[PDB]
Amino acid sequence: SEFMSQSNRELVVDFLSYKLSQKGYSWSQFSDESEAVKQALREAGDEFELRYRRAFSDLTSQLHITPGTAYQSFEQVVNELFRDGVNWGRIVAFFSFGGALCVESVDKEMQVLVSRIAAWMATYLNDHLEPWIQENGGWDTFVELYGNNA
Ligand SMILES: Cc1c(C(=O)O)c(-c2cccc(N3CCN(c4ccc(NS(=O)(=O)c5ccc(N[C@H](CCN(C)C)CSc6ccccc6)c([N+](=O)[O-])c5)cc4)CC3)c2)c(-c2ccc(Cl)cc2)n1C
Ligand SMILES: [Zn+2]
Ligand SMILES: [Zn+2]
Ligand SMILES: [Zn+2]
Ligand SMILES: [Zn+2]
């Protein structure tokens, strides 16, 4: 409880849909307090790209991500991102990484990867990040911290 929560799937699809919309795409092209969390994540991901733009490179070539890639390859990269533990900034970097991997996959004519990356992100969020998030005050704590720094 939970095996795979709908709220974790929704957070991921809403974030990825936003990043793909910024590149002119609809989520439907790739796949078949809550509003405040969605908006804070959108804003934090946009700020993360302005501050750490150099990291937004040819991710699918650097990580050899193809239509043959399975979940454990994605988990190894994200475990590197969280190698020294979890914090809010690293969670924003994780969402941003998934968004950039989706955008790059579409650019490299590997549209098939988008729904897969969404599922891998929702799995990692559910299994390896939600326990930390709940222990550290929940998503409404992030909304408060982000909004107050803003
Ligand atoms: C393996 C691996 C990687 C790897 O190993 O590192 C990386 C990788 C690559 C580059 C960068 C990073 N980062 C950079 C940042 N960093 C960090 C910094 C500070 C804190 N401290 S904090 O928690 O107190 C804090 C402080 C401030 C704010 N926010 C204010 C809002 C102000 N505003 C309201 C005015 C500022 S904006 C903002 C600032 C920082 C983070 C978010 C938003 C927030 N916050 O959450 O908003 C939280 C904690 C963590 C963690 C890692 C990872 C990738 C990767 C590859 C490609 C792509 Cl595309 C993505 C990822 N990969 C794959
Ligand atoms: Zn939603
Ligand atoms: Zn961008
Ligand atoms: Zn795992
Ligand atoms: Zn913990």
Curated annotation (Swiss-Prot):
Molecular functions per Gene Ontology: BH3 domain binding; channel activity; identical protein binding; protein kinase binding
Recorded consequence of changing G89A: No heterodimerization with BAX
Position of sequence motif BH3: 37-51
Highest taxon of source: Eukaryota
UniProt-listed SMART domains: BCL, BH4
UniProt KW keywords: Apoptosis, Cytoplasm, Cytoplasmic vesicle, Cytoskeleton, Endocytosis, Membrane, Mitochondrion, Mitochondrion inner membrane, Mitochondrion outer membrane, Nucleus, Phosphoprotein, Synapse, Transmembrane, Transmembrane helix, Ubl conjugation
Residue positions of motif BH4: 7-27
UniProt cross-references to InterPro entries, sorted A to Z: Apop_reg_BclX, Bcl-2-like_sf, Bcl-2_BH1-3, Bcl-2_fam, Bcl2-like, Bcl2/BclX, Bcl2_BH1_motif_CS, Bcl2_BH2_motif_CS
Pfam families: Bcl-2, BH4
A GO term from the CC aspect: mitochondrial outer membrane
Motif position, BH1: 80-99
Protein modification: Proteolytically cleaved by caspases during apoptosis. The cleaved protein, lacking the BH4 motif, has pro-apoptotic activity. This phosphorylation is partial in normal mitotic cells, but complete in G2-arrested cells upon DNA-damage, thus promoting subsequent apoptosis probably by triggering caspases-mediated proteolysis. Phosphorylated by PLK3, leading to regulate the G2 checkpoint and progression to cytokinesis during mitosis.
Entry text on domains: The BH4 motif is required for anti-apoptotic activity. The BH1 and BH2 motifs are required for both heterodimerization with other Bcl-2 family members and for repression of cell death.
Task performed by this protein: Potent inhibitor of cell death. Inhibits activation of caspases. Appears to regulate cell death by blocking the voltage-dependent anion channel (VDAC) by binding to it and preventing the release of the caspase activator, CYC1, from the mitochondrial membrane. Also acts as a regulator of G2 checkpoint and progression to cytokinesis during mitosis. Isoform Bcl-X(L) also regulates presynaptic plasticity, including neurotransmitter release and recovery, number of axonal mitochondria as well as size and number of synaptic vesicle clusters. During synaptic stimulation, increases ATP availability from mitochondria through regulation of mitochondrial membrane ATP synthase F(1)F(0) activity and regulates endocytic vesicle retrieval in hippocampal neurons through association with DMN1L and stimulation of its GTPase activity in synaptic vesicles.
Protein name listed in UniProt: Bcl-2-like protein 1
Source organism: Homo sapiens (Human)
